[PDB]
Every structure is written in C-alpha cells, then in structure tokens.
Amino acid sequence: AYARTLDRAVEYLLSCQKDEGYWWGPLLSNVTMEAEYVLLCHILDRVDRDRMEKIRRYLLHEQREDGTWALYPGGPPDLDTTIEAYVALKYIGMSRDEEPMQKALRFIQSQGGIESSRVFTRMWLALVGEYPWEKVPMVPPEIMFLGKRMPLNIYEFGSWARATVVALSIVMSRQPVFPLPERARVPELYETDVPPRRRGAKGGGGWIFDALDRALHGYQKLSVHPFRRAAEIRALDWLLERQAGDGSWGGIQPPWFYALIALKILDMTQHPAFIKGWEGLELYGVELDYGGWMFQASISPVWDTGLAVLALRAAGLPADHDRLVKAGEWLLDRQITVPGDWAVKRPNLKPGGFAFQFDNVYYPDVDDTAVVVWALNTLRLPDERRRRDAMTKGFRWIVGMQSSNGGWGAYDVDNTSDLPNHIPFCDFGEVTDPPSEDVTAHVLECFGSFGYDDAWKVIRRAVEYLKREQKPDGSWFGRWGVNYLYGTGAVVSALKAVGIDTREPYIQKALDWVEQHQNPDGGWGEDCRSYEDPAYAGKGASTPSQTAWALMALIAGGRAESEAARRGVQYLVETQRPDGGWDEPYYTGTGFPGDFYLGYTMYRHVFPTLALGRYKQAI
Amino acid sequence: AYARTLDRAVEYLLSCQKDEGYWWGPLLSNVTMEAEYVLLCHILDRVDRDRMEKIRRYLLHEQREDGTWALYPGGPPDLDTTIEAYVALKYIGMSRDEEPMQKALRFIQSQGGIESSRVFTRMWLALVGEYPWEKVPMVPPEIMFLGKRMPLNIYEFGSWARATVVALSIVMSRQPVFPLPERARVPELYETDVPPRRRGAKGGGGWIFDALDRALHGYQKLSVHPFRRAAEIRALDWLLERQAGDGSWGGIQPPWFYALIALKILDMTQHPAFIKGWEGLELYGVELDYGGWMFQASISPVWDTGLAVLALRAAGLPADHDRLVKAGEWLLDRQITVPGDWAVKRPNLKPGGFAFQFDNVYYPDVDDTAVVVWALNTLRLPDERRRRDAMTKGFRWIVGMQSSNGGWGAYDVDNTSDLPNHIPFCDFGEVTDPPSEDVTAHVLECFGSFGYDDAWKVIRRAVEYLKREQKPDGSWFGRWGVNYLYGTGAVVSALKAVGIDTREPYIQKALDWVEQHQNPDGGWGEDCRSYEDPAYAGKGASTPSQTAWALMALIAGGRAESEAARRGVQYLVETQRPDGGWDEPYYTGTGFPGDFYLGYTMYRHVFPTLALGRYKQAI
Numbered sequence A, B: 001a002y003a004r005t006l007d008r009a010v011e012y013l014l015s016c017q018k019d020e021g022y023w024w025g026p027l028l029s030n031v032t033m034e035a036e037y038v039l040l041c042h043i044l045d046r047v048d049r050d051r052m053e054k055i056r057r058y059l060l061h062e063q064r065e066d067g068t069w070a071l072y073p074g075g076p077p078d079l080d081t082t083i084e085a086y087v088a089l090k091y092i093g094m095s096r097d098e099e100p101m102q103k104a105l106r107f108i109q110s111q112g113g114i115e116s117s118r119v120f121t122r123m124w125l126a127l128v129g130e131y132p133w134e135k136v137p138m139v140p141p142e143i144m145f146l147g148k149r150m151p152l153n154i155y156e157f158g159s160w161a162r163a164t165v166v167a168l169s170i171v172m173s174r175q176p177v178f179p180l181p182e183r184a185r186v187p188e189l190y191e192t193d194v195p196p197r198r199r200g201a202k203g204g205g206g207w208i209f210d211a212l213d214r215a216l217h218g219y220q221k222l223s224v225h226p227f228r229r230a231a232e233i234r235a236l237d238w239l240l241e242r243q244a245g246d247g248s249w250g251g252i253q254p255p256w257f258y259a260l261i262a263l264k265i266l267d268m269t270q271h272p273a274f275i276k277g278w279e280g281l282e283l284y285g286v287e288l289d290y291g292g293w294m295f296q297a298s299i300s301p302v303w304d305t306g307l308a309v310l311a312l313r314a315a316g317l318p319a320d321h322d323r324l325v326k327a328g329e330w331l332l333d334r335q336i337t338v339p340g341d342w343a344v345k346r347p348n349l350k351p352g353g354f355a356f357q358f359d360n361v362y363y364p365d366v367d368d369t370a371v372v373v374w375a376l377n378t379l380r381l382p383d384e385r386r387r388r389d390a391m392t393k394g395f396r397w398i399v400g401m402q403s404s405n406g407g408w409g410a411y412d413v414d415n416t417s418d419l420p421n422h423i424p425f426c427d428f429g430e431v432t433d434p435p436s437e438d439v440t441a442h443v444l445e446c447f448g449s450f451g452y453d454d455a456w457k458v459i460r461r462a463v464e465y466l467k468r469e470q471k472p473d474g475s476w477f478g479r480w481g482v483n484y485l486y487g488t489g490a491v492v493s494a495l496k497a498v499g500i501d502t503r504e505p506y507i508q509k510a511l512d513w514v515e516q517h518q519n520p521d522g523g524w525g526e527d528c529r530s531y532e533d534p535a536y537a538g539k540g541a542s543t544p545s546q547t548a549w550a551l552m553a554l555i556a557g558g559r560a561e562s563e564a565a566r567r568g569v570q571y572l573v574e575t576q577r578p579d580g581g582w583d584e585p586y587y588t589g590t591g592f593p594g595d596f597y598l599g600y601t602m603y604r605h606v607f608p609t610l611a612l613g614r615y616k617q618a619i
C-alpha cells in the first residue's frame, strides 16, 4: 500500500539533494526581515532599485485581504509586522492612498498606531527619525563591563540576544539618525484616537528597571560619559572577534543587521569586517518565481542534511548508499573544533558540536549536534576512523553541555537566569536559553542509538526532567517546533529509544492524548495559536509534518497497528503529490513561542518520509 | 635636441598607465620576502607545489656567482638574506650538495653560521624548530598594557614596527613550533668554527634591557602568567581593528605575515580576518616572465600615480589632458577620511591624507599626501569643488602633522623617542619615525605650488630645520631614497619653490657638491653603499633617476645653462631606449638606511621625464 508512497517520497528527497551532498530548504518567517533589509539599505546608502522592486512584489504578495500581515500563514493581523511592512512599501515608493496602504493604515490606526508596537519597531523607526530616541528603552555599551558573574552580564542572555545586545549598545550609545526623504516620512502612524496598548517586558517589569531606564536616558543627556569610549570599543571588539565565516554574526538576521549599522556608525565601512558582512547578505537572499525576493531569518543546511539522512535511512537506503555517504562526508567537514561562547561555562570541555548554518563556529547548538552525530552513527563511511572520531567528540560535547536540571538547552548551559527577562528593552520573544523538552529528547534518542539506556546516570537525570515537565494532559511543550504534537512526538520517540517502558502510565497517557486530537481527515495538525490560547493545543488544520510527528509517537509507543495509526498513514498516502513530495501551507516550526514562527520547507518531505519508514519498520 | 627624447618618454609613460587611470610599478627588494613566504606557507599548511617551483626559479635566478644573495643588486653578500634563501630552497626540495647550495652554505659558515644572523632570521628558524626559542629576544604581549604616555608603549614605535611588534607578542607568547620535514632540517648552519659575530641592537644595548630580556625568558618559564590572556586578546583586538582593506596589515610584508601566523596560533583560520588576510596575498605577488614568482614587500600605486602626473605635467601635457584627468579622478577616490593611528597625537585633526598602497586607511603618510595633493593642484578636473575640497583637507592634514623641530615624519608626529632603538629585539633597520629632510622637502614644495612662502611661520620652522640638518659638504641625507643626491635634489628643488633665494651660500654650497660628483659619462649615480661608507656619498654607477635628481637640484638652483647641466641632459638623451623608457639595474630607493633597499620600477621613467620637462622649462 504505502510502499509506493514511500518509494516516491525517497526518489523525491534524493532529487532535492545538492551536488556537494547536503540538503537545504529555505526558512520562512515574516516580512519584517525584508522590511528591515530595505531600511538597512537606506541606512547604508546602498539601495538597488531593482531589488526594491522584487521586494515590493514580495511584500504585497504576502499581504492579506484585510491589508495586514501576520507572523504565520492564516494568523491574526500583527501590528508590528504590518507597521514595518507599511513603512517599507512607502519608502520603496508607494502612495499612502493606494488600496493596500489604505487598508493596512486603517488597521495600524485601529490599534493605537506606532505607540503600540514592540521596542524594535520603534527603534528601527527611531533610526530613520520617525520616532523620538528617548522613548526607546536604553541599553548602554557599559553593559560590557559586567563580569562573568554579575547580574545582567552579556553571558546571562541567550546566544541570540547576546550578540544583538552588544551590537545595539554601540548604536544606542550614539543614537544616530538617518532621515527618510520627505516623500516617505510616516506621521500618519500617530494619527489615532485609540489609546496606545503597549506591550510590556516579557516577565513583567520591576519599577527598578523602569527607574534604571529613566536613569540611563538621563545619563545619556550629559556632556561627558567617562569610560564610555572604552565600553564601545569593548563591544566593537566583542563583535569583531565573533563575526561568522559567511560574514554574518550568529548566522541570524538581527545581530547581523545591527552589527552592520554599528560598524557604519563607527566609520568602518572601509573595513574588511563590514565589506564581508555586507557581501554575506546575498547568500541568505532568495529569488521567488513570481518575481519577488525574500531574505532568510537564518539558513538550515546542516539541520536539513541531518534529518534528511535519518529519514532516508529509517526509510530503507543502505547505510553505505553512495548518495548518503556523500552527505556523511559533508557532515564531517562541518564539525566545529574551536571554543565558542559556551566555553565560558565549560572551559575544560573539548569542542565537537555542529551548527545550524554553513559556517558559524562560535555557536554550535545541542539540537543539531545530536541529530548530526546520531545521523552519522547510522552511516557506513569510507574513513571509518574519522566517522568514529567525529561522533565521539560530538557525543562527549553534548554530554558536557547537559544542564543542572538534567535537560539540555540549545546553545548554553544553565542559561536559566531570570533577570534579563524583565528589562524594558526585552519585550519580544525569549531572552534566555534554558533547557527544553524537545532538545533534551533529541539528545536522548541520539544517545539511544549508541545503545546507552536508563542505567547511565546522565540519561536518568534527563528522563526525570522530562517526567517533571510533562503537562497535565500528558503532553509535552514544543519549544522549537509547533507544538504539543512536536514535543510529545519527540519525547515518546526518545524514551522508547533509551529503553524506557512504553507501557508505563505517563507514556500511555501521552499516547492517548495523541489519538484524541486526530483530525477527522485522518491526520493531525496544530495551529500556532496553541502558544497563545491553550484551547488550540493539538487543534489545527492537518499538515504532513505534524501528522508524521503524532504518527512517530504512536509507532514508538507500540501502537503501530492502531485505528488512529492506520488512519494517519492513510492521510500521508493520499495527500502525497505525484512527484513524491507533500504540501504544507502552514508553519510547523517555532522561533519564539507566541512571537516568531518559522516555516521549515523540508519538514513536509522529510518527516512524512521518516514516519512512513518507521511504520514500515514496525511490520 | 632633447625634445624628441622627452616626447618619447611621454608616449611611454602614457602607455604604462592602467585603465582605471593609475600607474603602478612593481617594488623590488630581496629574497627574504619569497623565502619567508615559503616558510609561511609551510606553517599555514598551504603549500602549492606549482608556486614553490616558480619561487625556486626566482631564488636561483637571483643568486650570484659566489652563490650568495645581497640586499641591492651589485651589493655585498648578505648573511641573513642568504641563510633564509638557503633554508627556503632546501625546503622546496634541493639537495644540500648541488652547486648553489654548496657555494651558499660555505658563505654561511665562513660567517659564523646561523648565530651571526639578525633576530628575525633566527626567529623564523625558531618557528620551524631549527633554533632554540629561548635564544631569541623576547617581546611580551603585556607590552599591550603600557599607556599612551609610558616608555615603550606601542605608540613610541614607528608605524611599520608597531604592527609587527603587536602581532609578534602573540607569537612569542605562545612560542609555537612547526617542525620541518627531516629532508629539510638545516643543522649544517651551525657547523662552523668562525666565532659568531653577532649584530647588536640599533643604538646599542644597555645592560638593563639585556637583563630585562633574561627576566622575560624566565617569566616565560613559569606555569602561570597572570593577566596574560588579557594581554594577548588586547593584542589580537588591536590587530582585528586595523586590518587593511586588501586583507593586509599596514600594506607591508612583515606585520601581515606575522598577523597571519598569530591568527593561526589562536585557532582562527575559520575566521573572516584570516581568510581575507590569506587571500589578499595574491595581489602582492608577481609572475615573472622567466617563469618565476616574486612577492612585493609593498605596493606603490598612489606614489607612482602621483609622481607620474607631476612628471607628465612638468613635461607638457595640459592640466586638463583627459588622460591625466582620469588619474586625478582616481586620486580623489583614494583620499582617506577616517582617523588613523596618527590621531593618537592629533585627536582634533581632521583626516585628509593619502596612503602608499591601494586601500590602507589607517596609515596615510605625509610623503604621499604631499605629492598627491600637489599633483592635484596642477590639474583641471570636472568636479572643481571636489578637487578644491580634497586639496584643502589634505593641505590641512599635512600642516597639522608637522612635528616639533619643524620637519615632517612619514607616518607620525614627534615619533622621536629613543628608548625603542635599544631593546634586544630591534637589531634591524629603523624602529622609530622621526622627521626627515626628504619628506619635509616634498611637503615644502607641495605648499609652494599653492603660492605660500617663507613669510608663513610653518615654512620658516621647516626651512630652519633643513638648514640645521644640512651636511658639512652642503649635502642632505636621503632617508627614503638612495641617497645624498636624492635628498639634496629634494631640498633644493623645494627651497626654490618656497621663495628662498638660490644665490644664498648654503644653497650654492649644495649645488656645487652636485656638480662635483658628476660621473665622467655625464650622469650621476650613487651606490647604496653610501649608507655604510661615507666614501661612496655621491659615488656610484650612473642611473637615470639619480641623474634626474641631481639635474633637478641644478635646474632649481638657476644653473640650468651649465656644463654639468648640459652634460647630464645629454646622458639621459642617449641612455634612453627606443621605446621611450630607460633602464636602471640599480636600486635608487631606500627602505631602511643600511639594512633594506627597494627598487622603484617607475623611477627610471618618471624622474628622467620630470627632469627633462624642467630643463625644457628653464628655456
């Protein structure tokens, strides 16, 4: 039955593979990337009229009937996203009258306008002079003086926020303004009666930071700030030391863009770092068929390659299939052998992890490292001592990265501080990188492949962690993927691999929860709204990936031969396209719960393949 | 008569011009560049068999009958240069038996072998493990802590030594060893009876530094050096901040090579600065027609372009000659607008100088700046406000750069400390950058073109400087060009331009000195030996450039219609080639008096043209 569905899915993956041997699907997010890119170009005085065009097309193409833009497809109109898109389009050259602008503008106003937007949106507008710099939370370069062990030192922030903070402190120190030509100034963002419904800091704001901010805005007013040049230079140097190979910073949009502006501020456009940083941008860009251009929030070659391999293997292809071997070889050249920012908490730990992007040595993450190492462990490569060696370094690093509670974060160890989550500036997404169920799960299944089990103390501490984190209804939160189906799917698949007994209560209680949210059409789905409203947990239009996930949990928990299980497999078999792939107009990936979602282009092909390979395995 | 000679020279220069509008002749030095490059490649594990070949041919081609290598052509065998060339060749794959090796080896031994070589030579050999690291003068990264105003702080060293010192402190801090394969180890450099005739520090070594060094080598022995990681990172950061546009450091061979090794030491080969640093090298390389490859100690596009323009103008071509305008345009895009290391002594001075290389913004030099600004002053470009403006910035910068004694240095102000010239490490060439007669002269003639004169206090302070620096026999030392003919030529040409009266005593006393050293064949010449033995002052085989220089002094001093003058003009008219150029198998450029000489490939064509244009001018 499904066999053909599977052989067709395989043939498709293999065709999607690149020459070098890796897989790489585009990462989808929202228009703030392109919108900011446009403003970035304006700031750097590097506007390509041709690019603007492809961008206007993209922006419009993404706008909805109501004239708004959301974070995920089929999501509520988002104010911030729409404001930035609005400003972007007006700059590119669109009359504030035209249908699109008008509809959007009304929505912006019906919300309290500019004043109801996140800090970043006001800060970007601040940069082009459409908003007072003094109404923007302040982050001083002096932050660079806080030692390793001090509240709010840059190492208490998550890897992603850290770099952004540093780059920003330089910018907010100079508070520069790059005026927009008159034709694009957007005062009409203030023209509203609705009261500003301002979003506060993540975990609530102590009157302390509130005061401290005001203090900092005052200190900014002075005519002489002692030791500030030093603080700046200490930040510029922090930046220069970490610039990634592709010229980015952390391989993510934010710090990259800010670091570039910061360098512009410091009159270093003639410097290598800037040139390389500016040039690197193109690699993240994407030409869309309908004539548009989009910029990726980040790139996922390694991650894609890793999963693709695991999929194709669990699906059939021999451990030495020349096509997989090509990938295995590629993955080895990716391993990172130098110290990163994690070393600040594990100085005696030898490097051996992998990153998400192509070249980003200072930020390997536990999630990738585990998937890659695990993937390798399922291949038969020529240089068997290199494969055997890589795995060990990777394995040991993961082990050494395990946090206190027994789980694993993504980039750092015990990056569980809470202080940063309260400062004014941080009102968007996560700011710290504490252990998560999904990452911890992947780590467990990775070890599991090697044979390790519940006897080893490391695994136990982890399992205890997952047990304590389980949700009342037996589900598990999905930190880096939408959502409860993603996490529950991971956890169960893992626990089954580390020896745990699937017949246990909590395991069963989870399995049940899965069967219970099966959509009528056979498959499962879970809308991104499940991060905001608990009523959506498990609910949503069925998607190939989310179906595959719930399907893995069922297969892992022994319920392979089940109604729900048979039903799910059917769904994937029917919904499959003639070429072998699958479609998925929804996002199933999570950047920050409730604030930023991603669309992993390969998920729709890889996971269904992996799940089918596991079904065919359980028979 | 000479007219055709001149018209021919013009046609030639115009043909040598590049499309972009600039002139750029290769800079010649000695084989330590290529020899070190080979060792550098070995260290970085990046050996291109094909390149090694082109280098072996080059090394061998440059070797002389006696089997040695000198600093300048027709110069005394140099021990250091030969040792390094010897080690280079043996590495590339040459038997220690072969004719060239044997002859060279014997010379090496008849000198006391390895032990009689400059610090660098022993340090390079130290790097590949053919010499104890503890016998090499030490330079600690801690040197990075000395504040702006403290004996031996990195800003008391000349721009060229500064960068080298910083890069090195990282290297000498780790004292790494990159073993040579056995087939190339060179113990035979010790096999000698002759006593080691060691060269001491430039200005003599106080027993203090001698002890201090011993101290440092001891402190090196310890198991814990507090604040050393910080010292290194302060050095590493200093380098990252200053890397040049082309990927070099200072646009000179030394710091560039060491900075690269330093980065490799810190495991930063995956970093942008390294990559760009490594790739940049090719631009300095040169394919030789006989199948060899040489590496330029530095590049001189700006310098060449500037003089070429001044030559072609003083020779005839209209100020708006489309071909010159192309150059003028190019020269404007070269002006540097950011702060460099000079700003540490002139923080309130606005940037507006030019560099020697293509892209090297942190190190504009006074010499180039003056020639360029002046060259521009003689042109009629389309954007007349840009030209008018640039000159202004440049003019002002030069002025603001003038040192205490009234003269100008090359890169810094009052970089006249003496302490650095005594430490053990510095036993090769200049270590500081004090004012010089030649630079000061060029500056004067620069202003002169603008109409300024002896009335303005600036000019006076300078002239007084020159007056006090004049030599007993009425000659002026040549700091950046071989030698007394170069300086005297500059000085007089200048003084004549700033209004001074040529009929004065010291002026005449100089002019005479010129006529008195005119070789029988009609032209003038001055061997590089004139830096070592005062007997050679003004003496040496006649060259087109050196003739043009003495010829300029004479034309400036009113002695245009003179026997010596007529005679000289004749020489240039005869020695001229059919194509229009001139040959010059000798070096007429100075890197460091007595230690490093350069061959400015364009001098032979440009100066003769300039001198002839000035003769035809005085009639």
Ligand SMILES: C=CCN(C)CCCCCCOc1ccc(-c2nsc3cc(Br)ccc23)cc1
Binding pocket: A120, A160, A161, A164, A252, A253, A254, A297, A298, A303, A356, A365, A367, A368, A428, A429, A480, A481, A591, A596
């Ligand atoms: C399935 C999980 C596998 N892991 C291994 C993925 C690694 C992390 C996510 C990949 C990179 O994506 C990001 C893009 C942007 C950000 C960001 N930082 S700060 C920030 C601010 C705003 Br506003 C919007 C976005 C960001 C973070 C991750």
Ligand SMILES: C=CCN(C)CCCCCCOc1ccc(-c2nsc3cc(Br)ccc23)cc1
Binding pocket: B120, B160, B161, B164, B252, B253, B254, B297, B298, B299, B303, B356, B365, B367, B368, B428, B429, B480, B481, B591, B596
């Ligand atoms: C004609 C004068 C115009 N001026 C405007 C020229 C600017 C100075 C010379 C151009 C660059 O040439 C150099 C090459 C190498 C060095 C060097 N530094 S440290 C060093 C050590 C050793 Br050993 C050998 C060479 C060096 C310096 C200058």
Ligand SMILES: CCCCCCCCOCCOCCOCCOCCO
Binding pocket: A241, A242, A339, A340, A341, A342, A343, A344, A362, B229, B232, B233, B236, B266
């Ligand atoms: C200059 C010191 C070299 C020794 C490096 C060990 C330092 C321990 O790493 C601490 C973690 O900080 C992150 C570093 O990686 C970023 C680039 O810094 C490069 C030079 O060390």
Ligand SMILES: CCCCCCCCOCCOCCOCCOCCO
Binding pocket: A229, A232, A233, A236, A266, A268, B241, B242, B339, B340, B341, B342, B343, B344, B362
């Ligand atoms: C980050 C401080 C920016 C203010 C610059 C003025 C500093 C004075 O210059 C001192 C001279 O040091 C050389 C600097 O130029 C090299 C690169 O540093 C870049 C950012 O300043």
